[PDB]
Amino acid sequence: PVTLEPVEARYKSFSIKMLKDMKEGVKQYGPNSPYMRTLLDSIAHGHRLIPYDWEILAKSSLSPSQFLQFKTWWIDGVQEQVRRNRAANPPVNIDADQLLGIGQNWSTISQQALMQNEAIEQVRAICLRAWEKIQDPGSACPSFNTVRQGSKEPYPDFVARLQDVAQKSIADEKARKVIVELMAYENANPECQSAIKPLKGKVPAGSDVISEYVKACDGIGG
Amino acid sequence: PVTLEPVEARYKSFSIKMLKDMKEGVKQYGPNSPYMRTLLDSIAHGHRLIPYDWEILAKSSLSPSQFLQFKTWWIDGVQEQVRRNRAANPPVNIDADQLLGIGQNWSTISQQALMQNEAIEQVRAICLRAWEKIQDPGSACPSFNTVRQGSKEPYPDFVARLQDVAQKSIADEKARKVIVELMAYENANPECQSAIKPLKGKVPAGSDVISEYVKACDGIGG
Amino acid sequence: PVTLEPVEARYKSFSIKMLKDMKEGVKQYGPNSPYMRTLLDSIAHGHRLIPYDWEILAKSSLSPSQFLQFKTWWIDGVQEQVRRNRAANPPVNIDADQLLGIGQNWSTISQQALMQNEAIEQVRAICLRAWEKIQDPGSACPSFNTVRQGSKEPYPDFVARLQDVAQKSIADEKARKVIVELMAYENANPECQSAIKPLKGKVPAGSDVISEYVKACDGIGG
Amino acid sequence: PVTLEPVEARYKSFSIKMLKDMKEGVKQYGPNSPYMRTLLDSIAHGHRLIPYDWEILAKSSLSPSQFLQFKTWWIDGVQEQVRRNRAANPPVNIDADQLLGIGQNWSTISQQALMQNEAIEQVRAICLRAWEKIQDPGSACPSFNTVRQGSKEPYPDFVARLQDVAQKSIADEKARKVIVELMAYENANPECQSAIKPLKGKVPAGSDVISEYVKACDGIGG
């Protein structure tokens, strides 16, 4: 993080304790567990992070295979970023090397420290979305056709895998909501399909569609 | 239809020819063929139709089984109509019997003829949506899980079944668009899945996502 | 929690440490372990919790599947709450959105902070009962017929499963007590049934019925 | 079509009869039957067609799968059109949205009606070539290697499949003529190959190469 004064910026490492908490989490819970999403966001919003710090936090906390993915989507997400910065009126002078932290203009701590708040919030959204696609260690992201509720499997465990696949694959949240409610009924088992059909497209008041489908299958299982 | 003067309204049957054209179509093409959607809309927007006329056109033109479905969803769609008319400020005084054309206030030709333009446009949207769910004669509406591209089957024939299932099942058009683009890739065969993946989430300019996926699989088949 | 002054209310996050203790527990012991019932109650009674805080604590500490259940029974328990608030004389003006924390009147931190103590104690009893029905991760709640003492299984381990099933299923505690004492004798194995029958319906003094049945089978096992 | 006056342009729908004739044809004969090529050309050359009209005619007359192909090659053919308009001296100011009829400059009937004759003839050649690649409903376009004269099959039926495959695949007509005359001899059956060889590369006067090969095999068959 970059600390300030009151005009100068002083750069100080992360703590030995804080780097230890992040390692224990990703290692046990997972990188995209809801405990770590809350913990990561607590650091990103409560500190000023330059592109040099995002490398330090991620190399320590992640696996070697998981740092390859992170650096990939950080790259792939800056490319679609500049496509939107040049297509805007007025053009914004934020180029690829400033985001990624490479070249000679932006490849030191003293150089990156004097970054504007508007670029800081631009890298923060790319790096937080690059973390959302990091996979679990032996896994590969599955397709919607293969996420099917098996026999003798609880229902809320099935509709939580669906929301996982849709968070990596689909970028828009409003489009995410459309896909999950449909595949919840279609991909389910017969015993649940028995129970949902008298409720489809009808939610009484102050509730979601997903809560009403878990309530209906509540005892079915094995 | 209801013809007028210039203040009085005269009601005249459909023609012998026009009732013959509608019968030939539904019988050969289908009720929801794009030829009949255009032909039906040509009558509904170019004439004034009371609830008594929608019965005459549908009983003649459809099968006995298809008129049971039509009258069902016409009923089911008026119920969610009044739920929205009473929940509005100011309340609208359009009740169930005026839409369906029953009771004693609204069960004759002289009674229904003096309807306001605002109720006419309200029944038109319900009856045109009730026609959209009429099935093909030996068929039942399938689920999204079962619409899968078989081997030796062309690709645009597969993504046209998808848009059929999504027109009956899903009421919102913006939500329809989200479901089809996803299931197009997932439910496809391997040979197409080979071809689409280098194009997913990237469309160059002035095109749809669906046109770019049919172009890619263009020669695959059997 | 909502802290006060002496008339204003200041809202401050949970601690990084406290959110870590709750995660370790649910993850290892379980959400309804007696260690966590004591720990949760220590926070609920020793702080002021708005509906916004109950979301923060539960999303972090629970699984994605377990947060679907929690939000379901929180909804299902507010509906039977208003049924009792309107049926009372005088009517109480506590409606559904104030409990759940939705709408525009009650969907911010500054709005919810000015809640009365009587609504605070009403949401506390619903959210603490919604936590009591959260299942273990691969499990589904069983029926009383299936909770049967197997061969080579200790006796107090069997009558602890009974009290688990009766805590989720049955809402009244006085009715819970009637069901467990009966099914303890009926659902048991023969070797225990041998030992309990000379003691049924007779407890000497200052003891429970359950302690006298575990004492009797004390060495039986395998 | 766009009708005129003598400076203003009035836009009027197609007739109910004319839209009926096009539907009967494509449905029975096929979209690329020689009856429909003559009928379509009769409308395109004898009327003024804007991009809005080409959508109306094609959506009604074609299948849902066949309208996906049409819109694809209309798109793919405008892209190679602008590549030739910018590479020319002087550059022609005809851009992609004017041809396709999208954006806000060219997305209404009043906007498109004031188009110049030179753009009208440019869209006409792209849409007429997009219709030439529409496939038959269960079919996929085959490769030249697979078009082989079977046993017990007439000869002019075989060399008519060849001219079909070469019309979709190959864009240039002078190159089309070279491929068919060669593959006619090579891909044929032995009994015909017996008969053609004393005539190859020799045509007497005022005839084609193809007429002289059908004459030679005239009775062979089964």
DSSP result, B104-139 = TTSSSHHHHTT--HHHHHHHHHHHHHHGGGPPPTT-
Q: Cβ distance D29 to D37 under 8 Å?
A: no
Instruction: Tell me, yes or no, whether D77 and D3 share the same domain.
Output: yes
**Could you tell me which chains touch chain C, where touching means 3 or more CB pairs under 8 A?**
A
C-alpha distance from B44 to closest chain D C-alpha (Å): 15
Place of tokens 């019968």: B23
Instruction: Name the residue among D61, D56, D55 with its Cα closest to residue D29.
Output: D61
Amino acid at A86: R
Tokens of B167: 């027109």
Partners of residue A201 in chain B, C-beta under 8 Å: 171
Instruction: Tell me, yes or no, whether D146 and D212 share the same domain.
Output: yes
Tokens of B208: 């749809």
CA A26 to CA C80: how far, in whole Å?
41
Going from the C-alpha of A182 to that of each of A147, B46, B130, B144, D126, the distances in angstroms are 13, 37, 21, 8, 39
Cis, bond preceding C154 (omega within 30 deg of 0): no
- Considering only the C-alpha atoms of chain B, give the largest distance between any 2 of them, rounded to a whole number of Å: 66
- CB atoms under 10 Å from CB of A156, counted, come to 22
C-alpha distance from B165 to closest chain D C-alpha (Å): 13
Instruction: Tell me, yes or no, whether C41 and C126 share the same domain.
Output: yes
Please report, to the nearest 10 degrees, the dihedral formed by the alpha carbons of residues C115, C119, C121, C127 taken in order: -100
Domain boundary among A140, A160, A192: A140
Total domains in the fold of chain A:
2
Instruction: Tell me, yes or no, whether A42 and A66 share the same domain.
Output: yes
Domain boundary among D114, D140, D166: D140
Task: Spell out the residues 6+ positions from residue D184 whose beta carbon is closer than 8 angstroms to its own.
Answer: D159, D162, D196, D210, D213
Residue B151 buriedness (CB in 10 A; 0-12 / 13-18 / 19+) = exposed
CA A194 to CA A188: how far, in whole Å?
10
Amino acid at C68: L
CA A111 to CA A101: how far, in whole Å?
9
Q: What is the DSSP letter of D138?
A: T
**Contact criterion met (CB < 8 Å) for A211 and C141:** no
Task: Spell out the residues 6+ positions from residue A180 whose beta carbon is closer than 8 angstroms to its own.
Answer: A159, A162, A163, A166, A210
Residue B24 buriedness (CB in 10 A; 0-12 / 13-18 / 19+) = exposed
Q: Residue C169's closest chain A neighbor by CA?
A: A219
- Crossing angle between the packed helical segments B51-61 and B64-86, to the nearest 10 degrees: 150
Contacts of range D90-96, beta carbons closer than 8 Å, 24 or more positions apart: D94/D118, D94/D119, D94/D122, D96/B205, D96/B206
Instruction: Tell me, yes or no, whether C131 and C147 share the same domain.
Output: no
The experimental technique used to determine this model is cryo-EM
Instruction: Tell me, yes or no, whether B79 and B164 share the same domain.
Output: no
- CB atoms under 10 Å from CB of B121, counted, come to 9
3-class SS at A92? coil
Instruction: Tell me, yes or no, whether A128 and A180 share the same domain.
Output: no
Task: Spell out the residues 6+ positions from residue D78 whose beta carbon is closer than 8 angstroms to its own.
Answer: B206, D96, D99, D100, D126
Are C and D touching by the rule of 3+ CB pairs within 8 Å?
no
> Among partner residues B35, B159, B219, which is closest to D140 by beta-carbon distance?
B219
Partners of residue C68 in chain A, C-beta under 8 Å: 156, 159-160, 210-211, 214
Q: Domain range spanning residue C202?
A: 141-222
Domain boundary among B123, B140, B157: B140
In this structure, are strands D2-4 and C2-4 parallel, antiparallel, or unpaired? unpaired
Instruction: Tell me, yes or no, whether B148 and B112 share the same domain.
Output: no
Tokens of A131: 């973390």
Are D and B touching by the rule of 3+ CB pairs within 8 Å?
yes
Q: After which residues is chain C broken (C to N over 2.5 A)?
A: 6
Instruction: Tell me, yes or no, whether C114 and C24 share the same domain.
Output: yes
Q: Residue D57's closest chain B neighbor by CA?
A: B35
Q: Cβ distance C123 to C54 under 8 Å?
A: yes
Instruction: Tell me, yes or no, whether B167 and B181 share the same domain.
Output: yes
Instruction: Tell me, yes or no, whether A61 and A146 share the same domain.
Output: no
Q: Residue B221's closest chain D neighbor by CA?
A: D140
Q: What is the DSSP letter of A206?
A: S
**Could you tell me which chains touch chain B, where touching means 3 or more CB pairs under 8 A?**
A, D
Partners of residue B202 in chain A, C-beta under 8 Å: none
Helix (H) or strand (E) holding D11: strand D9-11
Instruction: Tell me, yes or no, whether B23 and B129 share the same domain.
Output: yes
